[PDB]
Design a protein around this nucleic acid. Structure first.
Lengths: 83, 136, 25, 62, 98, 213
RNA sequence: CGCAAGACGGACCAGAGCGAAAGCAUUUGCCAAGAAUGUUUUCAUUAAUCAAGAACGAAAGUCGGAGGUUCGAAGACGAUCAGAUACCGUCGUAGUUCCGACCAUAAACGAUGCCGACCGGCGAUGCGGCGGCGUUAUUCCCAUGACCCGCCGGGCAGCUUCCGGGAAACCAAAGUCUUUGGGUUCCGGGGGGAGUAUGGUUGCAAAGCUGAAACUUAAAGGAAUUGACGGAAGGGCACCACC
């Protein structure tokens, strides 16, 4: 296409582009409210963690580090933040 | 040439080590083991010129002379181990291979099991000939 | 003459030139 | 060995060095289903009867 | 002039590949360079398979095959008519002939 | 000037009881001629016997090296000396666009029969697979190879030479390896491709006579 | 059937991967290293390209020690031949292998310097990540492998076309070049003489690096075209060919 809307691409286009190659540099990562059945409360873990996130008052281990996004121990649900 | 073998139907086996190189063909019957041999006549034993030691005809004459020697001793059937020159050399069996096997399939020998014992190297020594090969 | 055998003639002739120049020093 | 009789159902085409042997699908007259390809010399057509001195051999198809 | 983009072989990001000996010659040809044929073949052609099944100890003994991988140099492959000079367009056709 | 075949005694070859078809074949040997004895130059002959000739109605691509361990009188009593795949079969399996995975173990039975087994496996192109390749990552190959060896130690160290040969008559070792390794990479053409006898213990005739019934 | 020795790592093995290149393929262990991807980590211009200088550098070769299975420069013979100190064949020395030093060269080639930008399409593939029906395994789920459908980033490639270029062959790089400038290194100036002589320098040597002139010469060369030729491959025709 000779004519494109380089100014205003679709959101589906902008998520099908590398984080650096987007029209404004936006990350793919997010902050997630992880909570374990050990304790009650909510610990704030990073999506692409890369550390073994231990719980409050050393209950257990929540997060196991992997390549990209870190897996969560079965029982530990997560809730993605907005900002 | 007198065994206490049951004579009617129950077969008496040997194994014929058919080694067909490109310049000679060896039809060589042994026992089930291989340790004691029975008959061995080659291509070059029959036809007296060096170029037709490996002819399929010379190998036929051998396997006919093998088979009729093998019926005197009363080894009825033959297991088969076909063999090429092998090692670093050629793995494709010689021209005399099939004609020699057919020759004792036509003679009166029953055919047991056929396999390859072509000495295939896992990983070889250097091969005769140059870097630049066998030129002609 | 093959360029390789032309080169081999020089390396035999350079080799004999050094030979003669050792005899004169 | 029995001296059997076969019959030309169709000529498959001319083979040999100088095309000197008509390659022929022959039909036996003992069983009218058993049929082999055979190389035949001389002029051959459809309908005529062969006299095979053996019923074992077969012509290699071109 | 350059005749083949691949320079008549199949190394791209290697630099070096181990030479094999030709089966007909013994010319040391690079593995990627060599013309290769994996010929699966019966121990008997057509003239003996009729004669051996008749004179078998065993009923329903399928006659086993003979597995040889053939490595060729280019001078052996062309002289034995495995491969063949092709027209400058037809050279590029990498589809094996059926 | 004389026939050597005039003086050949004809002896029977017996298979041990773990096999079905008993009689293997007939082995001509020169009679005791002064010093050298009929039984003497007879008590180390290998017999490359196919499974189909040895067990009734089973696969005919498996062979069994059986050696004459003692000769009582007219019957040569054989004992296990090795197993190998027919090279026709073994060459049929080794083909392109799949990962050939192999493994050997220097492993010893209860009684002092130190064997060397050889496992093989071939990575299976799946039912719905469109990707031609079907290769295992180097770490996938050496978890299979680690499994292959651990299973071949298990079925040999724990039980005697009679009960490992009965595991080689089916694919009882090759199947358990094929089952276990599905969770790593699905390989299908899994056998123990060879078994090599290395160190036999001291000969005990009473031990062999229980293997022959 | 055993036994011994020294090589080599077939098939799987791919226009696949890894490495600065040379190169690198049996198992397992140990050692330190590395790209790529992932990153809402850290420093904040630390960078690019590089005279001099330096590491590595196939094979052959040299030096000393161990070894020498196979192959095999030289050498010996048998053939072939007019000759055949060649091709072919039988032997066989150094070498080929290993340890430790030397050598610094190859058609070391993608005959294509590196860094950065931009300029079409497509289906693959290798690697990491991301997401998405369903089949299968540990079955007993969950998470994981094996497939499957994509997306993204780097990677070796392939096809495709009037991007454009080029003398053309061909090239998405050899393009973005008379509408000529992103940065930088090395290097060419008709063919020979000549990588010669000379001097310097490195090396045990072999030789490596640097490198003329007199003289000679009207071309040498590139790509492509048409014929002719071929001891190249195919397809015909002919009783001045054969059957």
């Amino acid at each position: 296409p000779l004519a494109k809307d380089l100014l205003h691409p679709s959101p589906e286009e902008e998520k099908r582009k590398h984080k650096k190659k987007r029209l404004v540099q936006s990350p793919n990562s997010y902050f997630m409210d992880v909570k374990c059945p050990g304790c009650y409360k909510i610990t704030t873990v990073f999506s692409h963690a890369q550390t073994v996130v231990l719980c409050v008052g050393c209950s257990t281990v929540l997060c196991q580090p992997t390549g990209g996004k870190a897996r969560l121990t079965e029982g530990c649900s997560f809730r993605r933040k907005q900002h | 040439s007198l065994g206490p073998q049951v004579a009617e139907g129950e077969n008496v086996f040997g194994v014929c080590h058919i080694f067909a190189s490109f310049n000679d063909t060896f039809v060589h019957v042994t026992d089930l083991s291989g340790k004691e041999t029975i008959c061995r006549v080659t291509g070059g034993m029959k036809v007296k010129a060096d170029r037709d030691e490996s002819s399929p005809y010379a190998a036929m004459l051998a396997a006919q002379d093998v088979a009729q020697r093998c019926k005197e001793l009363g080894i009825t059937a033959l297991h088969i181990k076909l063999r090429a020159t092998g090692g670093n050399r050629t793995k494709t069996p010689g021209p005399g291979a099939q004609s020699a096997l057919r020759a004792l399939a036509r003679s009166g020998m029953k055919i047991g099991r056929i396999e390859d014992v072509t000495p295939i190297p896992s990983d070889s020594t250097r091969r005769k000939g140059g870097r630049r090969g066998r030129r002609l | 003459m093959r360029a390789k055998w032309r080169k081999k003639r020089m390396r035999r002739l350079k080799r004999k030139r050094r030979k003669m120049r050792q005899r004169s020093k | 060995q029995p001296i059997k009789l076969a019959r030309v159902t169709k000529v498959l085409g001319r083979t040999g060095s100088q095309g000197q042997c008509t390659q022929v699908r022959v039909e036996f007259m003992d069983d009218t289903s058993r049929s082999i390809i055979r190389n035949v010399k001389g002029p051959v057509r459809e309908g005529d009867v062969l006299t095979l001195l053996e019923s074992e051999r077969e012509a290699r198809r071109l | 002039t350059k005749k083949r983009r691949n320079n008549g072989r199949a190394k791209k990001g290697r630099g070096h590949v181990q030479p094999i000996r030709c089966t007909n010659c013994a010319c040391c040809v690079p593995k990627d360079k060599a013309i290769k044929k994996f010929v699966i073949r019966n121990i008997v052609e057509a003239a003996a398979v009729r004669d051996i099944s008749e004179v078998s100890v065993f009923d329903a003994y399928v006659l086993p095959k003979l597995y040889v991988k053939l490595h060729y140099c280019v001078s052996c492959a062309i002289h034995s008519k495995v491969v063949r000079n092709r027209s400058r367009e037809a050279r590029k056709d990498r589809t094996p002939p059926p | 000037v004389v026939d050597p075949f005039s003086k050949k005694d004809w002896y029977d070859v017996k298979a041990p009881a773990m096999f079905n078809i008993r009689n293997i074949g007939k082995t001509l040997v020169t009679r005791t001629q002064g010093t050298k004895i009929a039984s003497d130059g007879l008590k180390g002959r290998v017999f490359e016997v196919s499974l189909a000739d040895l067990q009734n109605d089973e696969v005919a691509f498996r062979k069994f090296k059986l050696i004459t361990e003692d000769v009582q009188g007219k019957n040569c009593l054989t004992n296990f000396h090795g197993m190998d795949l027919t090279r026709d079969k073994m060459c049929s399996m080794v083909k392109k666009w799949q990962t050939m995975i192999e493994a050997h173990v220097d492993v010893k039975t209860t009684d002092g029969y130190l064997l060397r087994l050889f496992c093989v496996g071939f990575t299976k192109k799946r039912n719905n697979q469109i990707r031609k390749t079907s290769y295992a990552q180097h770490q996938q190959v050496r978890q299979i190879r680690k499994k292959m060896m651990e299973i071949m130690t298990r079925e040999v160290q724990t039980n005697d030479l009679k009960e490992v040969v009965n595991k080689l008559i089916p694919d009882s070792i090759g199947k358990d390896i094929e089952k276990a390794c599905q969770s790593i990479y699905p390989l299908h053409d899994v056998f123990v491709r060879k078994v090599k006898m290395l160190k036999k213990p001291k000969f005990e005739l009473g031990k062999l006579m229980e293997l022959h019934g």
